[PDB]
DNA sequence: AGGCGTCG
DNA sequence: CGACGCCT
């Protein structure tokens, strides 16, 4: 790190304009301009020099040369020190709650974990959850609890049935120590492009691990997508396993490549693929790579038979999972 | 970038 | 439905 003191504080400022403000724009220009300054080979000595790179403009380069001078940002001192902006954004750290219900538990003299649970009322399912295991969800996973949740996930989901494919993705096919949550790809020959749809494939397995007492809550769940709390066993001993975030998803069998791409890589990863997919003219998605059209219009999918094969549609150096950070 | 599920 | 919150 060269000038890790205005990447932190202009990521600070992003997450207040976000969570906060609201402002979008702002957020996104922050984010670009500290991911930019954070591949800069030198160590910024001025605001004028920074504003040199591309993403940086003259209201980040003021506050640079502001944070160079002093040691600080004045703005962010007094944000630190604005109660309503706090809580605002401490709330935002509960899952299920974004900026406006933030800003209206807030705006309603909720600020509180404490609080919080004073007033479940105002709460709905998602976000009561997130409250009761706020504190084990801040805790990440070590990839030994990872590896022994995994069998529990394979091992059960044969049972039900051995024409189930279970992978878990997410930072764990990345190649990780530890994981914010279990990220789980889900497949069945029953589920397929040309098929009328099956929403009871992906509830027999959370079912059936909910019977296991392994899925413990659920805060969403369809025909694709779960997403909610499972647990390791204990038998008689303190400090169980803490709970943890588990999000399952059943991608048809023909789509399983681009499935894993989306579900392992990384939101920045993703994004930055998704982005040169439209570049070379194509669309990439968690199900298809169709190809861009005439002025606004993708097409039919072409045909992939593994990772590789998305890739060198848009011509890139297959980027080996672990890679994708 | 792209999209799934919840809310009212 | 839009807006929101969330997933990578
Ligand atoms: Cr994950």
Partial sequence: TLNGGITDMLVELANFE?????????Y???RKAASVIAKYPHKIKSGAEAKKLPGV????????????????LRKLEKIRQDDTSSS?????????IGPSAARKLVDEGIKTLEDLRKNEDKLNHHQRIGLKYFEDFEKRIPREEMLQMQDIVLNEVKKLDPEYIATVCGSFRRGAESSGDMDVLLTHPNFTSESSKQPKLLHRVVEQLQKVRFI?????????????????????????????????????????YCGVLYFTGSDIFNKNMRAHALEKGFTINEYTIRPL?????????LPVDSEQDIFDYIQWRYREPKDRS
């Fill in 293 to 301: 059209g005439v002025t606004g219009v993708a097409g039919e999918p």
């Fill in 88 to 96: 605002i954004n401490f709330l935002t750290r509960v899952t299920g």
């Fill in 216 to 256: 413990t809550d659920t805060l969403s769940k369809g025909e694709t997508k779960f997403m909610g709390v499972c647990q390791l066993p204990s038998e008689n001993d303190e400090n169980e396993y803490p709970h943890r975030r588990i999000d399952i998803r059943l991608i048809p069998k023909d789509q399983y």
């Fill in 28 to 30: 996104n220009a922050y």
């Fill in 18 to 26: 976000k969570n906060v403000s609201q402002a979008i724009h702002k």
């Fill in 57 to 72: 403009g003259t209201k980040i380069a003021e506050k640079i040369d502001e944070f160079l001078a002093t040691g600080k």
